[PDB]
Design a protein around this nucleic acid. Sequence first.
DNA 1: CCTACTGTGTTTGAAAATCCCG
RNA 2: GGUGGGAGGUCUGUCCCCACCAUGGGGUGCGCGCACGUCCAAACGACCAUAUCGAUAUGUAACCAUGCAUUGGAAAGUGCAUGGAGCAGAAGAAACACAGUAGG
DNA 3: CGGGATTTTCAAACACAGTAGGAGGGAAAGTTGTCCAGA
Length: 478
Amino acid sequence: SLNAKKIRLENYAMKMRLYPSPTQAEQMDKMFLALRLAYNMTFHEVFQQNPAVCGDPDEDGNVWPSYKKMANKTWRKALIDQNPAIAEAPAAAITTNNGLFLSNGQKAWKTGMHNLPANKADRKDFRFYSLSKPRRSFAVQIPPDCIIPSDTNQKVARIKLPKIDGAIKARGFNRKIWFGPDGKHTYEEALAAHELSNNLTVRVSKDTCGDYFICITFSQGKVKGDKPTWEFYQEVRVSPIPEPIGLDVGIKDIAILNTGTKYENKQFKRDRAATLKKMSRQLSRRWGPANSAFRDYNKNIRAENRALEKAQQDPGSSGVGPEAPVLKSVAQPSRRYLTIQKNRAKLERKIARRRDTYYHQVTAEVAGKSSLLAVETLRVKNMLQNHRLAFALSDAAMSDFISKLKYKARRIQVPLVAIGTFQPSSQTCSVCGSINPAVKNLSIRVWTCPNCGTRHNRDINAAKNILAIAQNMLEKKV
DNA sequence: CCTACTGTGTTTGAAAATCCCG
RNA sequence: GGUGGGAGGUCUGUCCCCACCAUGGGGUGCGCGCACGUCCAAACGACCAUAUCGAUAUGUAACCAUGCAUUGGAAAGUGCAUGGAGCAGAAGAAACACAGUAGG
DNA sequence: CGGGATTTTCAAACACAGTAGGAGGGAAAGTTGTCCAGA
């Protein structure tokens, strides 16, 4: 009867929605600014070849940044010496294994700059933190003593982060998680029984609009042998009698299963496309950025500011009061622009959330029933070759669906067998597999097979063929 | 001529040592 | 009753709440009314008021309770400090980096 | 003065440049009206 079954999972990440009083929000975004300034100062000093940061020079004369030299007190005290808006970041948010320099800078230099030394690697191809990409995280380590739920309710918390005061009110526990060895304890029971970690990672990430999400991540730090260092369970509902399932996707659909059920892609992109164009041409004529009529004003004022500063500093000698240096301001987007920007951002977030929840529901439904997933591909680049699906999958991001199927097939260990998109899936039949080249075109919906078939739906036939192929390759290993 | 979703890969703390306002 | 919406982590409907479109026409039936299923006309991220060239700006909304200062003789609000926020059915793994891409 | 809170150490430094020819359905453009969009 689709009952909930507790399953041990590797590394959970609770997704909540904090409610920080204005002071707490101010402290959080000041910490985001502190992390971005540490990022910028470090990676702008690596290109000046500062001996404090650069690692051991090699015998060839090359100079690399070594990340162990980059996470000591002396560096942070130099940083606070330069500017006072840099110590507000948590110390554990910068130096720890899951902080700003062994988790973000490491991957960034390993991927963007191809792991090349600072003397050879180029600068203008590396993306820093600025108004385009501010720092949307910081991963402190807290004790469960700072994670206090509420018992009058059954979904609310009380989280007080380091360096901040007020016990920020979380919301929405995933209470279907269970602690202890057999998953029979609530959070308070395991906190009192001492079967939980001490320093927990909360990766406080703010979304595009002000929405101070928190991620109280769990883990199994050491799983030496088979027992993890920590144990907890999570319950999801699985069909009483699962069967192998093959999935198909159509232009007018979002998913079709071999059982017969068909799911409709609401496809919100065109649904709100009229209002989308409304607000697009709205902000395209506003008085701030993303305008093409106020950027030029901002560039002009910045250029004249720098030119006058250069022509007043050296030629004027800055003795006591030479000339009259005026700076004014770089101008800001207007409130009327601001309200419409925030409303439109809420709208793209609304389609994002609607689509995300819809795919979450679809994946949750299929994953429990599917004892053996038989989807074709694990990537979208094999679905865009014919250009027919691209027009729909551009609006419906199917790679997120791929990822959701991937990690919801893993928590039950549901296999996900993938095969190449080259077989005569359309030509073959569900009964005898007779090859008919006329079916290749998508427009055919009903085609009576000459021998013993009627084939009123291609989607069922294709899913049947894919499932049969997946079974056959299991029967004889390739 | 500038903003913004996305496709893809990777990753997910414990423990001595030092500090700070009742 | 529909139109779009705001809070209850997210979605569907209701709950509470924000600004609008109709009181219409009609295909077929029953005895001027009722309409068996429809469809159209709407309302679409506010509406107002202001000034200066539809649209640019500005004062601006979407749950309940407590306390504080304020507007208030009031009735009820403003700001601040908090707290509380369902119901029926669904789900509830996130963060980082790279770039192309689409929009105007 | 003192007991929990923050905070350094484990613990570990360096990727990118290569080379074509393999498969198929999706596809019209380009009007002056009414109003539209900024004007």
